[PDB]
Amino acid sequence: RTIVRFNRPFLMIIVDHFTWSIFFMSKVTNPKQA
Amino acid sequence: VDRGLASANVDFAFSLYKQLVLKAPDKNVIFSPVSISTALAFLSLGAHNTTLTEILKGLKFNLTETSEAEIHQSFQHLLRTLNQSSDELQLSMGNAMFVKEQLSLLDRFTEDAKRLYGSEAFATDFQDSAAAKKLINDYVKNGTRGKITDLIKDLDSQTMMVLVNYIFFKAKWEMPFDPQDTHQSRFYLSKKKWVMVPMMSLHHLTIPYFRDEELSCTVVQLNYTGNASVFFILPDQDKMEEVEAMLSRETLARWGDSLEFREIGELYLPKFSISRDYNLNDILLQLGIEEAFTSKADLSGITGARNLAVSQVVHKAVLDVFEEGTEASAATAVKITLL
Numbered sequence: 001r002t003i004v005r006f007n008r009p010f011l012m013i014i015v016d017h018f019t020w021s022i023f024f025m026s027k028v029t030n031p032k033q034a
Numbered sequence: 035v036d037r038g039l040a041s042a043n044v045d046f047a048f049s050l051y052k053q054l055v056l057k058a059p060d061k062n063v064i065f066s067p068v069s070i071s072t073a074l075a076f077l078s079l080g081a082h083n084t085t086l087t088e089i090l091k092g093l094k095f096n097l098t099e100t101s102e103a104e105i106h107q108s109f110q111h112l113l114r115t116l117n118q119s120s121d122e123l124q125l126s127m128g129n130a131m132f133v134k135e136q137l138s139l140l141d142r143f144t145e146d147a148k149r150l151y152g153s154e155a156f157a158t159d160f161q162d163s164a165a166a167k168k169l170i171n172d173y174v175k176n177g178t179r180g181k182i183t184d185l186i187k188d189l190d191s192q193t194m195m196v197l198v199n200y201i202f203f204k205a206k207w208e209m210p211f212d213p214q215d216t217h218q219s220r221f222y223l224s225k226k227k228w229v230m231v232p233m234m235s236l237h238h239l240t241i242p243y244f245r246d247e248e249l250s251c252t253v254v255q256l257n258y259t260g261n262a263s264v265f266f267i268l269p270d271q272d273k274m275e276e277v278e279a280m281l282s283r284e285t286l287a288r289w290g291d292s293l294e295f296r297e298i299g300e301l302y303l304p305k306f307s308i309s310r311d312y313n314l315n316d317i318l319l320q321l322g323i324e325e326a327f328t329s330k331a332d333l334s335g336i337t338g339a340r341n342l343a344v345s346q347v348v349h350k351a352v353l354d355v356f357e358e359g360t361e362a363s364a365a366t367a368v369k370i371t372l373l
C-alpha cells in the first residue's frame with residue numbers, strides 16, 4: 001500500500017483544465033507560520 | 035484559453051514564484067499568477083513605447099509571435115471563460131479602475147478597459163485617502179466574499195488611479211476528507227523541528243500519481259468538482275530548493291504527462307489556512323518592468339499625455355484547505371500617480 005504523507009514542505013498548484021490558467025500557486029513551509 | 039496565453043501566463047507564474055522565494059526563502063508562498071498577469075495586462079492597455087514593451091515582455095509574451103492587440107483579446111476571452119456560470123464550483127474574477135474625478139481619460143482607454151477587461155471606472159476622491167482606501171478595500175472584500183480585507187494599506191493622497199483585479203475561488207473535493215479522520219500530527223519544518231497540525235486523511239484512493247526520481251519528489255493530482263484540480267508536489271526531505279529550481283512550464287507539462295493512476299493506501303494532508311501580502315515592485319523590476327515606475331514612464335494611452343506613473347503594485351492572497359474542499363482568493367492593485 002503506497003502512502004503519501006504531506007508532513008513536510010510541499011507545493012500546491014491550483015489549475016484550470018479549460019484555460020490552463022494557474023489560479024493559485026503555493027508553498028507550504030509551515031502551516032502555522034505567522 | 036488559447037495556447038499562447040497559457041504558455042506566457044505559466045512562464046510568468048514560475049518566474050514570479052522563483053523571485054518571491056529568493057526574496058523570502060523561509061516563508062510560505064501563496065499568490066494568484068493569473069490575477070497579477072491580468073492586472074498588469076490591464077495596465078499595459080495604457081502603456082506606450084518602452085513602458086509597454088517591458089510589461090508585455092515581463093509577462094513572458096513572445097512579441098515576435100504575438101501583438102498587444104492579440105494579447106488583450108486573449109485576456110478578454112479568459113475573463114469571459116473564467117466568469118461563466120457554474121453549478122459546481124465558484125469562480126469569479128473582476129477588474130476595476132478607481133480614478134480621481136478630475137483626471138482626463140482618453141475615451142478609447144475607458145472603452146477598451148470596459149470591453150476587454152470588464153472594468154468599470156469608479157470616480158474616487160483620493161485626497162480623502164481614508165475614504166478612497168475603504169472604497170477600494172470594500173470592492174475587493176465584496177469580490178472575494180470577505181476573504182481579502184486589507185489589500186490597500188496606505189494610499190498616497192496624491193494618487194490619480196488604482197487598477198484592481200480580484201479572483202475568488204471555492205471548490206469541493208471530488209473525494210472529500212472525513213473530519214472524523216483528521217488528527218493532530220507532526221508537520222516537520224526541518225529534519226529536527228516540527229509543529230502539530232490537524233492532518234486530514236483519505237484511505238483507499240485511486241488518483242493520478244508520479245514519483246519523479248530525478249527530481250526527488252512525488253506528484254499527485256487531486257480533483258475538485260468542476261473544471262479545476264490541484265497538483266501537489268512533495269519534495270523529499272531537504273529537497274525543496276532543488277525542486278523549486280526545476281519549476282517551469284516544461285516541468286509542469288512533463289509532470290502532467292507522466293501521471294498514472296495508482297491506488298493510494300493513505301493520503302495525509304494538513305488542514306491549514308495561510309496568507310501572504312506582497313509589495314511586487316522589486317519583483318517586477320527584476321522581471322524587467324522598470325520604466326513604468328520612473329519619471330520616464332509612458333502611460334499616455336490612459337490620458338493622452340505622459341503624465342502618469344506607477345508608484346506601487348501590491349498583491350494579497352489567502353488559501354484555506356479543509357476536509358470539504360478549498361477556498362482561495364487574491365487581489366492585485368496597481369497604484370498610479372501624477373508624473
Ligand SMILES: C[C@]12CCC(=O)C=C1CC[C@@H]1[C@@H]2[C@@H](O)C[C@@]2(C)[C@H]1CC[C@]2(O)C(=O)CO
Pocket residue numbers: 015016017020021037040041042044283286287288290291
Ligand atoms: C503545462 C501546460 C501545458 C503548456 C502550457 O501552455 C501551460 C500549461 C499549464 C497547465 C497544464 C498544461 C498541460 O501540461 C496539461 C495540464 C497539466 C495543465 C493543467 C491541467 C492539465 O490539463 C492536466 O492535468 C491534463 O489532464
